[PDB]
Ligand SMILES: Nc1ncnc2c1ncn2[C@@H]1O[C@H](COP(=O)(O)OP(=O)(O)OP(=O)(O)O)[C@@H](O)[C@H]1O
């Protein structure tokens with residue numbers, strides 16, 4: 001129902017493992033998300049970091065979604081006609097890492113995490129489609 | 140199956156993927172048409188790519204045309220092509236390249252890979268920082284698991300040509316003359332056979348006089364001989380000291396470092412343990428030792444620093460893309476005619492990074 005249709009649509013093709021819609025305005029809240037996974041824990045702290053003015057310090061400092069450490073690969077989050085930030089996660093030691101894209105609509109972030117070895121390119125495309133679907137539902 | 144195409148400020152390299160080496164290496168020049176190697180072999184009677192960026196599409200088009208019909212003599216709509224591009228290539232440009240592929244050449248699938256990324260891959264890594272000097276431009280490109288970090292990428296507008304220019308400036312400052320480019324193939328080949336990189340420049344210059352081996356001799360075509368001395372090392376030193384060329388910029392060693400400094404702290408060590416040199420202009424004897432020392436000086440005294448210079452590093456980019464475009468994983472990565480019909484030229488922005 002409602003916002004979950006979108007999440008579940010994104011999870012449908014085999015290729016991703018978390019996803020989530022978070023309304024960024026006023027106080028940032030999760031509108032829908034994959035149950036009991038990382039994005040469901042995104043905090044107002046880390047959304048403000050995705051939406052704030054400074055667009056460099058995160059490249060050196062890194063950042064977190066939920067409490068998961070992430071490297072910002074390509075930021076065009078606030079840029080007209082692009083709306084995307086690509087990222088990839090960080091593991092201590094040997095664990096795998098995964099790509100992430102976030103796409104900003106009028107009121108929303110769309111967050112998608114690929115599975116292991118899934119190309120940040122496919123992730124970027126999908127997460128951009130869905131967010132375009134949202135963006136002409138005037139959201 | 141897949142075609143690989145490396146387009147350079149001066150040299151183009153094309154071939155099939157799975158091949159160990161290209162199958163057409165030719166100058167990136169047009170002048171019936173006059174393209175590539177038929178240009179610099181019937182010279183008397185434009186460089187479409189400039190500092191790695193394409194500046195002229197009709198030309199660029201005609202090179203590709205040449206690449207397919209006259210060079211690789213193959214059918215473009217039968218083959219998924221991997222094209223390479225420069226770090227920070229402007230956006231309208233990645234689009235027009237995509238447009239021209241699927242629409243003019245009607246290709247079935249295509250990808251655009253940052254040149255540096257192939258080279259890092261050619262060496263069996265996915266994290267590292269790569270110094271790539273060709274002919275028109277030099278870039279430093281930090282990389283994390285196969286993804287270039289554009290914010291920390293640096294661009295130094297001096298490579299091969301600037302150094303051929305510089306050698307021809309000093310050699311003429313001595314007396315000799317060259318102003319026809321038939322007489323420049325020459326100075327280029329001198330630069331290539333004889334130039335090297337001083338481990339310590341000042342000490343190299345101050346002890347130059349106790350020569351023994353420094354000195355060398357080169358017979359020009361017109362029978363004439365030239366004596367070459369501290370030029371052997373002085374011209375390539377402009378790579379570390381671009382003041383030698385009149386410009387106010389940092390050298391490759393301080394640039395690499397400057398790139399490492401704009402990256403995420405948690406991979407800096409990994410970038411210092413994995414600095415990879417590529418491109419024709421990194422071919423100089425000594426450059427690795429020199430980069431090693433230069434950055435061991437710039438870094439914390441505890442940073443482990445490995446400079447890596449692979450012996451095939453002039454073809455690292457193309458070798459790199461032959462390996463990549465030949466993996467199965469690569470089709471879940473490519474861009475199809477259908478995706479192209481669905482979404483237009485814009486799709487490069489999403490899919491290639
Ligand atoms: N043995 C050598 N020693 C010194 N320089 C060399 C040697 N061989 C080739 N070069 C120089 O390297 C340059 C070749 O450039 P490269 O093969 O990296 O591709 P490219 O066309 O320069 O692409 P771009 O410059 O846009 O990256 C030429 O200027 C050439 O003179």
Ligand SMILES: [Ca+2]
Pocket residue numbers: 061062404405
């Ligand atoms: Ca950190």
Ligand SMILES: [Ca+2]
Pocket residue numbers: 146147148254273418456
């Ligand atoms: Ca090149």
